[PDB]
Amino acid sequence: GISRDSAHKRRATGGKRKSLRKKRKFELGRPAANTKLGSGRVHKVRTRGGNTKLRALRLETGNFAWASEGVARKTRIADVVYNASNNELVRTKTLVKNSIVVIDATPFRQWYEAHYVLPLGRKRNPKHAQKEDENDVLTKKRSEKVMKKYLERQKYGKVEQALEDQFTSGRILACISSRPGQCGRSDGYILEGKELEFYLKKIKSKK
């Protein structure tokens, strides 16, 4: 294998410090995940003894947080549009850390209608004019405190219009925050404020 030490790499002015204790077991690193977006597989391996680090391969889904509240919802990752550095990881569609991935916009719609009674996004009327079962679970009037609690609530549904265009189309972007190669998950959060409006210039203008 190849170790992760300084066995290579001539010292600071050019010359070659040659050998000095050829090899050690602990000082090595293994071949990486290279996790394509797939159908959710996983593998177990020994680490430095006792610890069980879990890597990911051929992964499908994950749970992803929200910005202004920290609302973590699990949903199927659809696809990818962008990775941060290696375009030769973009084209093969490989799951890495904090790359620009589009996910779902589905479960955040139904989860939020307690606080965000106005449904996000605006679904098409004349084919979805029937409710299965939307309009009753929006308000219901409750004859009680919770609808009255939702009156001083829904004062925070002043969200960004760009995701409101994106929620009504049903494909939101997000940023997978955790490490795929340390715990075997795809855990993240939606980019909302400033890097959301930034990276579309990195995508739609380069489209």
């Binding site: 600071a12 202004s68 509240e69 941060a84 004062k155 925070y156 002043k158 404020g193 890097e195 930034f198």
Partner: protein, 155 residues
């Protein structure tokens, strides 16, 4: 210096725009938790209201300054966010009880809050975590930086 020029996006990790629902309104006049070293060194005022990102910055990154603390002089500053400083000392021989002019050279990293450091300015130095293959220090304070003769004066 930066208008966030990067092929990815750069941001100080650990903060988020939380907009309406909040315990009170903790504006803090900027969403940037600027820490301090607290070892007697005053913080630079530009660090708190900075737009620079600099994950390896000792004030604003995932860094806590460790080790010892020293002073010295700087020679080269071409490389990015990184200057080339120089220290002086002596050596005690056995044959003569006499001394010499030898020196070492440690390359060091800069936050851009000490923008425009030149030859031969005077810069104190403090230690931190390894950055990349040589850099285990970080610049503390432009303390004097004054050559009253050749370097530090306009013309």
């Amino acid at each position: 210096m930066a208008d966030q020029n990067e092929r990815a996006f750069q941001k100080q990790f650990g903060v988020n725009l939380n907009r309406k629902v909040k315990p009170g309104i903790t504006k803090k006049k900027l969403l940037r938790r600027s820490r301090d070293v607290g070892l007697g060194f005053k913080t630079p005022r530009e660090a708190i209201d900075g737009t620079y990102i600099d994950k390896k910055c000792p004030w604003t990154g995932d860094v806590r300054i460790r080790g010892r603390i020293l002073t010295g002089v700087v020679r080269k500053a071409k490389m990015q966010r990184t200057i080339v400083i120089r220290r002086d000392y002596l050596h005690f021989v056995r044959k003569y009880s006499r001394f010499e002019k030898r020196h070492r050279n440690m390359s060091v990293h800069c936050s851009p809050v000490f923008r425009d450091v030149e030859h031969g300015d005077i810069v104190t130095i403090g230690e931190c975590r390894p950055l990349s293959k040589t850099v285990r220090f970080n610049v503390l304070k432009v303390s004097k930086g004054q050559g009253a003769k050749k370097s530090f004066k306009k013309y």
